[model samples]
Target: KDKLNPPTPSIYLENKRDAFFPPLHQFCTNPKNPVTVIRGLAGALKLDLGLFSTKTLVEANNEHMVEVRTQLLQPADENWDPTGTKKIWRCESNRSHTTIAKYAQYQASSFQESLREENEKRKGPFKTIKFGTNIDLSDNKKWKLQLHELTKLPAFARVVSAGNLLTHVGHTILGMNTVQLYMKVPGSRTPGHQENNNFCSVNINIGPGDCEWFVVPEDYWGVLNDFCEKNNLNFLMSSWWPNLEDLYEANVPVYRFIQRPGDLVWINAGTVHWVQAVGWCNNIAWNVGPLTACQYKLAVERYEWNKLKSVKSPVPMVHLSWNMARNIKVSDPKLFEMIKYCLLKILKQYQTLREALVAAGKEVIWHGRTNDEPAHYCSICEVEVFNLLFVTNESNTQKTYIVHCHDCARKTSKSLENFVVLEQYKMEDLIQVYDQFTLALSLS
Candidate 1:
């Protein structure tokens, strides 16, 4: 959630809403010109960062995450044994979840493809005239187009879907809320997951690293499919990495931002991007999407699909909440009262959770996501913390951990005495707050 240094200066959007970095449109319209500085965006947009770093950020990342942790600590000279005093933050980083060099091979293959296409472009008239046949070297604009090739770039895909990590956001432990310095290893590229629905990923480089994100065009789904048929492999499988050379038909664009520490980079959603972490670097990243009814629906449709699949919707589609009612209820009120009854039934389940936590003498400090997307952080597990429940133990005067993930809870039924987080959002309050918001929005 991050940056790297780059080879050149660039055109930029100072605000999130000022239309795209105009050069992108020109690139898309004139393919013969070759996309040199492709800043073309599909639906994705970045906000100059529109956000950045400061003291508050560091405080957020370090102050929390472990506040409830083993609250006790021995003297500075304390022993390593139980008699000694040690405090553990229990915060999570991106490294724990994937295989070594997660997408290194794929990125290498994609870059090779880029080089292949770039070399191919160096053919016909391109050889005779640097910017292609009959192109003017005197005209600077045309010259840039003739020299750039989006295809001859690496792939860093960031596609949005309900089935991805956004589904499980909200909660105090969210990576979204915490201060993040994502240091991804070469072996830790991600698998196919729905990502960044509307907001572009804005990252500021903090340390030295070799990082770049690869993007596949949405229109190129067919191109990828063609490649799949050509190679007889499903991208869904372990074998489906892109060619080492350029994608034969699929027009892929590799957006390289060799970021310096202060350089801010924006990665819009819609493009399928894969980022490669060539070395150690730190950067803070946050995803943001402003809500409109249509965009909300597009997101919700995905959320519902995940629920149907038993992946368990991680968070509300867009309203941003841990409270169940906030996510549902108003989703539809064709029959206002009936919806109330339905909401109450859902509340009953949460009450059960809350009641149990109380009996175990546990407390919940709800951590909510300030942004639209879900937080993929979970303190207890080594993986994404979907369907959250947090609770630490009595001896944990420091309160090192709370309950966690679906599996831990299921396995939790076995240890009633251990006490786990039953529910964070109160079922009762969901209704009142909802009616107020719904009626207000309608009348206003």
Candidate 2:
């Protein structure tokens, strides 16, 4: 019956909520240990760091360029489904680019007036929302801000550190090791969605204001997915916010609360959540993945489901699996077995596909792909194209190589001569990597 309870009460850091505060010695000690605690709980954990004061938040945003999304929301009437009632969120090309200062000044005055008028307009008020969400800081020198140095926010330090999976395993993926910024005015909302690729996320609000959050436990994700489909809503990747009244009537348990300034929110893997700003605020957030079976299994399942539904997954599972085999030495047998099985299964499939191509007179060339490089995807089916890259150019004038899986390549051209097979690995070398990883796991 408690707010965090039927939502299934998640375990707190240091066995209590307030223990999350700095000097975060307890939190940082054995940073890898909390992965299973979060996995077992099935809900998000919230804490107050008490450092990101209003002045610090404003200073952090001083000169950065922000990409803003203009949001539209209206009052949800008694029987509203919410999805059919509101317009889709959009980022106008002309208005999307703005300095953080300019955006703040523009909304500072009108936002206050709107807030004042809102109290007079009955229960829910119609208002415009401005969201500067997931602003990349690493791409440009001017935009970059070192969050750890600024406020001593050490929540994800160990997980995103050089010793961790994503760092040691190779490749630089944002929201993995790098952080993203969010600045929003009142009424700004992020509709229901899951951060599937990154196992978990830590969001710290830097505020003069607050944000309200509604998170559903991971266990009922399937129920929510079906609920969305039944209501003609986008399943998982929702464009429309859920109607809380309707969701309550459906008997779904939700963790609802206000996140004030300096608050930290830890959202677990596969948890469905939606957020809205109660006032103007800035938030710093990033995702971290622990090297464990619970995390990897959830990630791969989401990858497969995304493939089945034709959704483009940001993380290429096949490519990552190969990279993990070449780089990581795991002690957790369950984690080792999962990665082992994935590599073997993928390698077996790769061998069969290669033999069929070679028998049909196709040639395989040595065109290596590095770990840091962006993965190629099938042009037609949108499946990720890994080591055995089947490439063809659709336009002679354009000079672009369209990649495809073996099946899609055959479908694209029956003769198969038009496609070039760019192999990133020799069969023996890949086999060696698998064997080496298996041996290392067994011996350790």
- lDDT per residue (tens digit) for residues 1-444 in model 2: 243334423334433333435434323223332212222111123233333332443566576677877765444212222344533322111237777676667657656777798888872244455677767655435433354343333434333564355565356676565677777777677777888563677676767677877777666778778767876666755565666655677677777666766556667667778787887777877776656676688889998988888888767788788878877767778888899999999989999988987897888877776556776788888888878877775442254656778888788688876677879878999899888896343553
CA deviation > 4 Å runs, candidate 2: 1-65, 72-98, 111-125, 143-159, 393-402, 439-444
lDDT of 1 at 165: 31
For every model in order, what is the number of clashing pairs?
47, 1
lDDT of 2 at 21: 50
Model 2: how far residue 122 lies from native, Å: 12
Worst ten in a row by lDDT for model 2: 35-44
Q: Rate the local accuracy (lDDT) of all candidates.
A: 0.36, 0.64
Model 2, global lDDT: 0.64
Among the numbered candidates, top TM-score falls to 2
